Amino acid sequence: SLSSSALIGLLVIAVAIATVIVISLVMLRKR
């Protein structure tokens, strides 16, 4: 019942987007 180690590749993306949030504001400065 949903037991694939591949889930690691999906989790890394979640956090990969978080770091983009803090940078999102920096974009408004160069926009």
Swiss-Prot record:
Known tissue expression: Expressed in placenta, brain, heart, lung, liver, kidney and endothelial tissues.
Residue ranges crossing the lipid bilayer per the database entry: 5-28
Post-translation changes: The BPTI/Kunitz inhibitor domain is O-glycosylated.
Compartments where located: Cell membrane; Nucleus
Free-text function comment from the UniProt entry: May play a role in the regulation of hemostasis. The soluble form may have inhibitory properties towards coagulation factors. May interact with cellular G-protein signaling pathways. May bind to the DNA 5'-GTCACATG-3'(CDEI box). Inhibits trypsin, chymotrypsin, plasmin, factor XIA and plasma and glandular kallikrein. Modulates the Cu/Zn nitric oxide-catalyzed autodegradation of GPC1 heparan sulfate side chains in fibroblasts.
Family per record: Belongs to the APP family.
Subunit structure: Interacts with CPEB1. Interacts (via NPXY motif) with DAB2 (via PID domain); the interaction is impaired by tyrosine phosphorylation of the NPXY motif. Interacts (via cytoplasmic domain) with APBB2/FE65L. Interacts (via intracellular domain) with APBB3/FE65L2.
The protein's name in its UniProt record: Amyloid beta precursor like protein 2
Organism expressing this protein natively: Homo sapiens
Source taxonomy: Eukaryota, Metazoa, Chordata, Craniata, Vertebrata
Shown part of the complete sequence: 689 to 719 of 763
